């Protein structure tokens with residue numbers, strides 16, 4: 343944003359108040375102010391606003407998004423000295439290395455665990471297969487066995503990958519974009535098992551993060567699946583909780599993705615030197631990380647000295663046990679297509695819009711082949727919005743709802759009270775050869791843009807011509 347000031351974005355689930363405390367120490371010593379914000383959907387927001395030169399100076403996200411940011415050139419190469427590099431674990435530096443260059447500072451290693459209420463379930467299940475019978479028993483006490491976020495595929499991935507699902511195949515040191523493991527026997531069985539839990543009313547398809555959290559933290563469900571950041575709210579709730587290895591599926595460990603929370607510096611920030619100093623000399627210290635960790639736990643931190651200090655925490659131990667059974671996320675630019683593909687597949691199979699076999703058949707192609715469409719359409723969208731904003735100027739107009747790219751298609755700026763129609767985008771043709779007949783709308787209201795009507799898959803994904 344502005345010279346002589348640091349703006350930082352970080353997810354609203356993380357220790358942002360803790361990070362702001364490090365910010366306050368920074369400005370006390372340097373005179374240079376630090377504002378920490380937690381925009382919704384910042385990982386997508388970032389490439390849009392950072393592409394126009396207006397991001398934060400620093401963005402925090404798991405490392406999987408950073409190769410895409412790097413490729414788009416939205417990230418400054420970082421310059422830590424040999425002394426500093428030695429203070430963090432090699433494995434965490436690898437997570438932020440892209441085409442041979444370091445593109446962010448690693449902060450902490452995250453993996454999902456099984457979090458369970460010890461009073462409801464003193465001996466938690468070792469197997470996913472045991473869960474339906476546990477739920478039946480608990481429901482007779484007005485309690486349920488398990489609730490977790492079903493809207494974000496990050497949370498369902500451990501079960502999909504358990505019996506052999508994978509994202510991109512890694513062989514001979516590189517990811518093969520064409521070899522996507524979301525549609526093999528293991529992945530199918532995993533997603534089928536999830537869909538059966540919903541069918542049998544052990545879970546509801548619409549369950550999201552805040553719903554699952556609220557249910558666990560009020561003592562209503564015996565288990566959830568969540569990361570280290572969630573432990574602080576559970577502490578506040580006084581639930582007697584344990585954090586443990588995820589259940590097995592078909593005898594195999596669940597295989598969560600491992601993320602390294604990382605901090606990248608905007609390539610357009612004028613304050614790259616200030617950004618460096620904050621990250622290297624304030625945040626990545628025992629004291630900086632303690633401040634953040636005490637707000638919302640980070641997991642296993644990248645800084646060796648502090649990771650050693652924390653290592654006996656049994657909840658971190660469980661985290662590390664689940665991470666060892668899991669796999670590091672790729673950081674390749676195509677991970678954005680992978681996550682689109684699998685989120686679509688899980689939401690569709692869970693809601694009955696597609697069968698599991700069709701959902702996954704399509705996701706395998708979409709993970710491999712959709713990124714180029716996304717990139718083309720995103721770039722065309724930014725151009726259309728620029729043109730539209732210019733014409734609003736020429737017409738003495740102002741946008742009721744701003745022009746935006748929503749990862750699927752382009753919405754021109756609109757007046758309050760105006761509906762906008764767009765053609766179904768080419769993206770949906772894999773589902774529907776007649777997607778070119780489809781139309782999707784949004785309404786520009788006093789409360790901003792409405793959600794798409796119909797929902798995108800309903801509008802665009804079912805072949806409407808037999």
Ligand SMILES: OC[C@H]1O[C@H](O[C@H]2[C@H](O)[C@@H](O)[C@@H](O)O[C@@H]2CO)[C@H](O)[C@@H](O)[C@@H]1O
Pocket residue numbers: 353355385404405406407452494495496497569601681
């Ligand atoms: O569900 C897809 C989503 O998964 C990961 O995001 C995680 C993030 O890594 C965690 O730190 C925590 O914030 O929860 C997120 C899931 O809601 C990937 O990092 C992300 O790029 C992907 O879209």
